[PDB]
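request received
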Amino acid sequence: RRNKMTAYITELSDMVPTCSALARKPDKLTILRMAVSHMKSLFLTDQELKHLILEAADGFLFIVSCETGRVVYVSDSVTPVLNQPQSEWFGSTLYDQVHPDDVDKLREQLSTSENMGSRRSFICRMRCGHFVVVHCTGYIKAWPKFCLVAIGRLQVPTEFISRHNIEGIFTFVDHRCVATVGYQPQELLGKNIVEFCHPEDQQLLRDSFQQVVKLKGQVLSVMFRFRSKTREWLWMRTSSFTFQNPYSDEIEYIICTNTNV
Amino acid sequence: ETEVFYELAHEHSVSSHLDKASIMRLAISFLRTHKLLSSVCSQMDNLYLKALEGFIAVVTQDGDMIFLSENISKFMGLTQVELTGHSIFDFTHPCDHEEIRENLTLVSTERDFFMRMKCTVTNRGRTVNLKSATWKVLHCTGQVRVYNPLLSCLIIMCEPIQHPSHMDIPLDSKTFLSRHSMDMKFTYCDDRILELIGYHPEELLGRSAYEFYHALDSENMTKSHQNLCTKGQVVSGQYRMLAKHGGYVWLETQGTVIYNPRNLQPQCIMCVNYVLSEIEKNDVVFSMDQT
Ligand SMILES: CS(=O)(=O)c1ccc(Oc2cc(F)cc(C#N)c2)c2c1[C@H](O)[C@H](F)[C@@H]2F
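response:
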């Protein structure tokens, strides 16, 4: 157990080039005095923690007035997060730097009616370069009237997708179907997919639907002729698989990617 | 004498007296941190860490928490001095360890995950001892860096997920709560959903949340549910909920597993849902429900 304190001192010496600048470790008491000089020589530094936070979360700090939203201060990390000079931010109001439909959440959070040192945590869309989603956490400090001090961090047609009940009725269609089959989504939803299938190919697709269910979780790809809105049989590669609830495993829907072949 | 063991100026009414390994571990850790900070870099040291809703952690490839921000206490109870220089694995849930190990390795450097860490603070805001160690889920987002036999570091920001029962943070008009069963079916939802997404709560009760997910999102949303059940809390990614009469709204959700405290059993999943957008593509009909 004495190793711990010994490794500690060899580790300490191994952390400084002026402790590798001797033939050997000085007296253990002398080693403690030797390091005290180095530690005092030079991690509370503002500039270090700002970069730690930009490293970790890709976020910047800013202070705006609660009454007007004017940015009394913005740190220089706004340029790497949002590609916006402090020129644009400083001497402006956060309202003109966020999405028009977010100014309301913005005033709500900027309110001082009920909450001073109160916390704040919201999400908004800030203009860049287009808007980016920004998580904002902060508090409210006296202006010297009121001011939000806050951190904002950044964070991460050939076919059409459909969802079906096991019967085969479209319960979901994405907007791309108008360019692949010509139907408006509402013309497909509520109807069965076999309705738009050429009668010759109808048993093929009908068989795939049972198979995908028995072949639970797994993809199979049937190929049939699809009736367009413009009425022309279009070959269609439908790759389907089962989706099931991650708790009860009850089948939630069949998911199909209809690709014109 | 050993008065130099009362005399190390470590970054001062706490640099004076420290016990056993506290003086040394802190010092070695500080110098290693400075070594990394040189690699990254190129007054207001109190605003930055009082705005954060989490703490900053620099953890090496071995697993050493060579740097922990001063605020870890407000969220974890355990002090920066109790933990700096100690191994991440001695204060995290063991069944999370392997995940932490693959997030410490090496080539995208971005990291986003959820860990469970020991916590000796309590809901009221009063601290407790280490035998009284609860598990708190932290959303960890950061970068792994190579720095100098090159070393390797994980600079993460670790945020707690507010418990739906207890929260002193302003609730927005764009945030609404929903309760769900383990079958992901709504068992309750807020009155505001109608004003924001257009649906009355009555017509969602009994409907699984998979009915309303935009088809492009629902698998990324199962993975988030499979991590909320494994770990008890989660933050979702941005997702689309189909609106009542065409369209979709953007949402982010903090999920929490709620335990019946009499039988110690999973009763429901409470979800705090954040509306990020207005109805988008209301002209477009996606679902049979919205017709
Ligand atoms: C993954 S999550 O953030 O916790 C989540 C996020 C949203 C959840 O349900 C919701 C709640 C809501 F307001 C809109 C939608 C949609 N679309 C789904 C659910 C969850 C959980 O799955 C819980 F089981 C439930 F399924």
